Design a protein around this motif. Sequence first.
Motif, PDB file in Angstrom:
ATOM      1  N   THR A 136       1.466  -2.891  -9.276  1.00 37.85           N
ATOM      2  CA  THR A 136       2.339  -1.733  -9.409  1.00 37.85           C
ATOM      3  C   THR A 136       1.839  -0.833 -10.531  1.00 37.85           C
ATOM      4  OG1 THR A 136       3.801  -2.950 -10.915  1.00 37.85           O
ATOM      5  CG2 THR A 136       4.359  -2.977  -8.572  1.00 37.85           C
ATOM      6  N   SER A 156       5.870   4.618  -6.371  1.00 38.19           N
ATOM      7  CA  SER A 156       7.146   4.140  -5.855  1.00 38.19           C
ATOM      8  C   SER A 156       6.921   2.950  -4.931  1.00 38.19           C
ATOM      9  CB  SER A 156       7.865   5.259  -5.099  1.00 38.19           C
ATOM     10  OG  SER A 156       7.859   6.466  -5.845  1.00 38.19           O
ATOM     11  N   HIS A 157       5.765   2.934  -4.278  1.00 42.19           N
ATOM     12  CA  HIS A 157       5.383   1.818  -3.428  1.00 42.19           C
ATOM     13  C   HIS A 157       4.496   0.849  -4.195  1.00 42.19           C
ATOM     14  CE1 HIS A 157       3.925  -0.529  -0.058  1.00 42.19           C
ATOM     15  NE2 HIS A 157       2.685  -0.156  -0.316  1.00 42.19           N
TER      16      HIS A 157
END
Lengths: 204, 137, 159
Positions: free
Chosen positions: C95, C99-100
């Motif tokens: 991450t 957002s994904h």
Amino acid sequence: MKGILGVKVGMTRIFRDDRAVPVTVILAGPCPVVQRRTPEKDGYTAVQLGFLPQNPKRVNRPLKGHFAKAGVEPVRILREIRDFNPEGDTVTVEIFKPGERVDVTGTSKGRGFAGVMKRWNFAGGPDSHGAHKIHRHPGSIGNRKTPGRVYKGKKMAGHYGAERVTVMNLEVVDVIPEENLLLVKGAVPGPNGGLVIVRETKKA
Amino acid sequence: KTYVPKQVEPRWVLIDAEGKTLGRLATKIATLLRGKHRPDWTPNVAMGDFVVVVNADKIRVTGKKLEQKIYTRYSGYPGGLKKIPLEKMLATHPERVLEHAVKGMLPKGPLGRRLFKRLKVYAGPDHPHQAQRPEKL
Amino acid sequence: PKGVSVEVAPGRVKVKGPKGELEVPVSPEMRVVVEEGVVRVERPSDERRHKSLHGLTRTLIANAVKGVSEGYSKELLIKGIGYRARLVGRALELTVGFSHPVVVEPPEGITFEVPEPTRVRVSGIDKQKVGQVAANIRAIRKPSAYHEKGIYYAGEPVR
RNA sequence: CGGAAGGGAUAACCGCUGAAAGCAUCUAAGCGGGAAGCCCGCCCCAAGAUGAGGCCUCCCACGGCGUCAAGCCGGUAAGGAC
RNA sequence: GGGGAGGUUUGGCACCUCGAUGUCGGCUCGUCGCAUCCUGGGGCUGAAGAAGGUCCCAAGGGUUGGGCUGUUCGCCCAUUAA
RNA sequence: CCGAGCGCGGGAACAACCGAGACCGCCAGCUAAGGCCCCCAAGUCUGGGCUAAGUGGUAAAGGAUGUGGCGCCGCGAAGACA
Ligand SMILES: [Mg+2]
Ligand SMILES: [Mg+2]
Ligand SMILES: [Mg+2]
Ligand SMILES: [Mg+2]
Ligand SMILES: [Mg+2]
Ligand SMILES: [Mg+2]
Ligand SMILES: [Mg+2]
Ligand SMILES: [Mg+2]
Ligand SMILES: [Mg+2]
Ligand SMILES: [Mg+2]
Ligand SMILES: [Mg+2]
Ligand SMILES: [Mg+2]
Ligand SMILES: [Mg+2]
Ligand SMILES: [Mg+2]
Ligand SMILES: [Mg+2]
Ligand SMILES: [Mg+2]
Ligand SMILES: [Mg+2]
Ligand SMILES: [Mg+2]
Ligand SMILES: [Mg+2]
Ligand SMILES: [Mg+2]
Ligand SMILES: [Mg+2]
Ligand SMILES: [Mg+2]
Ligand SMILES: [Mg+2]
Ligand SMILES: [Mg+2]
Ligand SMILES: [Mg+2]
Ligand SMILES: [Mg+2]
Ligand SMILES: [Mg+2]
Ligand SMILES: [Mg+2]
Ligand SMILES: [Mg+2]
Ligand SMILES: [Mg+2]
Ligand SMILES: [Mg+2]
Ligand SMILES: [Mg+2]
Ligand SMILES: [Mg+2]
Ligand SMILES: [Mg+2]
Ligand SMILES: [Mg+2]
Ligand SMILES: [Mg+2]
Ligand SMILES: [Mg+2]
Ligand SMILES: [Mg+2]
Ligand SMILES: [Mg+2]
Ligand SMILES: [Mg+2]
Ligand SMILES: [Mg+2]
Ligand SMILES: [Mg+2]
Ligand SMILES: [Mg+2]
Ligand SMILES: [Mg+2]
Ligand SMILES: [Mg+2]
Ligand SMILES: [Mg+2]
Ligand SMILES: [Mg+2]
Ligand SMILES: [Mg+2]
Ligand SMILES: [Mg+2]
Ligand SMILES: [Mg+2]
Ligand SMILES: [Mg+2]
Ligand SMILES: [Mg+2]
Ligand SMILES: [Mg+2]
Ligand SMILES: [Mg+2]
Ligand SMILES: [Mg+2]
Ligand SMILES: [Mg+2]
Ligand SMILES: [Mg+2]
Ligand SMILES: [Mg+2]
Ligand SMILES: [Mg+2]
Ligand SMILES: [Mg+2]
Ligand SMILES: [Mg+2]
Ligand SMILES: [Mg+2]
Ligand SMILES: [Mg+2]
Ligand SMILES: [Mg+2]
Ligand SMILES: [Mg+2]
Ligand SMILES: [Mg+2]
Ligand SMILES: [Mg+2]
């Protein structure tokens, strides 16, 4: 890939919850599978559905020889649905659960010899300030010495309508198996009483 | 008064393909479609041997022809000009690329077109084993 | 060049070992030659073209060996605040502001480790795959040239 | 209700491995990524595709002259037209 | 200061047409070029971000309605992804 | 030279460029320009090089570790270039 032949019975609107919905009713009567296209015999995969009860009168044709090798009541019509091989028996509206979307095919109404303005929805000249003999005319069609000819496929008046028209992604609003009925989102080519084939959409 | 042959007889022939330079090979094939090697040559009758090529999907070609060389193709309509590169010809219809050459090397008239019909190209081999088939080189 | 299991071919060269087998295709107009403790390489001419191909193959095969020998593996730092990583089974998932959360497929014959949310080892036999896949990860979020965020190899910060 | 999705190959461009040129280089062998564009995919036409294709089914011998050549004249079959 | 491309402007020349090749603007219908206005993809930035600037790739589609003037052009009003 | 040789051959086609001045006939021969892989006659001729751009298949100032070749100066096993 599903498939099924039917007739445009007509259309009205029903109410889904607190909202009115325009729907076209299609009678996709029981279609007796007649033959099968296979990669070995035919070179491709598909199924030849029959449709509508024929009187053994018009069946004077050796069509009976085709119906015999399948032991089927003679039908009035029969077309293939590409790449769709159902279990050996008969297809019906059962393959269409509500909320599914379908691609409907039909022969549009025949608008005869149509002017460019109706056909191609051109502009045509002024109702008013002069001219008064080209009101619905298409005006210029070319240039000068070069190219000194008209383009292939130029838009011009002519016969228009009564052609193979396929609409897509129509919602299956309902399905009445007690009547081999099939409700849709209303806009489906062709006139009432017209043969029409309904397939599975290509949205997904 | 000069000699003139009678109803000949179609000599058939079988050519390979692999490793052959496209154009180089194409020449020989043409000269076979016409007589030109048969001493009773007659330019108005057509009696050149039938030719059968096989494994055309293997033809050599120099330079960067596989990407450089592109075949054009006009349709009557505006912008109807298509540009298909060699790489895509063989990738799809490959017997095609051998034809676009020999045909382009035959005479232009009605007879020339008959001669083209005397050519049979395959990617295989496994061609239809009719009768004659004297392989050559 | 010890550890070998090398074998010559009409154009390619096999190289087995403790790690696996790797076909390392090389120019046909080249002599490989297999001594016993080392593999040599011979070029037919001293022309301009042959020079280039000699040295290339001289390394391809060398790395093929050192590959099944010690093997190859790359490091990958992950700077920036929220940016962190973990290992979902065989696959890596990182991450980095997106957002994904980025799921990552482990390619055929490669496995990576995350001995820390910041550290990321890419272990593998095929040097090519290591170099490529390593970058692929860095690409998922190259370093900011305005901060100190994103994936890094192990070289100076872009300032 | 449509413009797509998706597959494939690419442009500028970004890279892996990598010599020639002991380092260095996306490249010369080789490889990955990458556009509303290209090739497919969707819809429509389409075997005069004279390269006239394919499948299922149906009707089949001459009934008179042409011995050789292919035809030629009347009655019919499945079937078609008026 | 220097070298070019293009053939939309203004010219030069007087080559086909003076026993005729109808001239501007508008309307209608378009199609093509790309030296790209928008949208798609990039490099650099004196790029924090948002927004720009500059060059590169890319025609596939798109590229509004009015005021003034015969106007093309241009100014202006109200919008626009343009 | 064309005009008056828009008669013949070459140049893809093309008065004046290259070859050559057509009295008539020939199913005879040598040539010219140009050509001798296929359309198209005649070498896929021989020997030695160069070119990897489809250059050749038609463009400049100017720019570059393209590639092959001759020459000159300098460094080097007393140890360089990287
Ligand atoms: Mg009107
Ligand atoms: Mg009037
Ligand atoms: Mg009038
Ligand atoms: Mg014209
Ligand atoms: Mg014309
Ligand atoms: Mg009705
Ligand atoms: Mg080119
Ligand atoms: Mg003729
Ligand atoms: Mg003629
Ligand atoms: Mg796509
Ligand atoms: Mg797909
Ligand atoms: Mg590109
Ligand atoms: Mg490198
Ligand atoms: Mg390469
Ligand atoms: Mg390459
Ligand atoms: Mg791709
Ligand atoms: Mg795409
Ligand atoms: Mg789109
Ligand atoms: Mg495809
Ligand atoms: Mg294709
Ligand atoms: Mg039709
Ligand atoms: Mg059709
Ligand atoms: Mg037919
Ligand atoms: Mg058909
Ligand atoms: Mg047929
Ligand atoms: Mg059949
Ligand atoms: Mg009988
Ligand atoms: Mg009998
Ligand atoms: Mg100048
Ligand atoms: Mg002009
Ligand atoms: Mg002028
Ligand atoms: Mg004049
Ligand atoms: Mg004068
Ligand atoms: Mg006149
Ligand atoms: Mg006139
Ligand atoms: Mg006018
Ligand atoms: Mg005008
Ligand atoms: Mg942009
Ligand atoms: Mg920004
Ligand atoms: Mg800022
Ligand atoms: Mg600032
Ligand atoms: Mg600022
Ligand atoms: Mg924003
Ligand atoms: Mg560039
Ligand atoms: Mg451009
Ligand atoms: Mg306006
Ligand atoms: Mg304003
Ligand atoms: Mg706006
Ligand atoms: Mg603006
Ligand atoms: Mg005169
Ligand atoms: Mg004279
Ligand atoms: Mg003339
Ligand atoms: Mg002449
Ligand atoms: Mg010619
Ligand atoms: Mg001339
Ligand atoms: Mg002439
Ligand atoms: Mg002359
Ligand atoms: Mg001379
Ligand atoms: Mg010649
Ligand atoms: Mg030039
Ligand atoms: Mg010049
Ligand atoms: Mg030049
Ligand atoms: Mg120059
Ligand atoms: Mg420079
Ligand atoms: Mg010195
Ligand atoms: Mg000494
Ligand atoms: Mg150096």
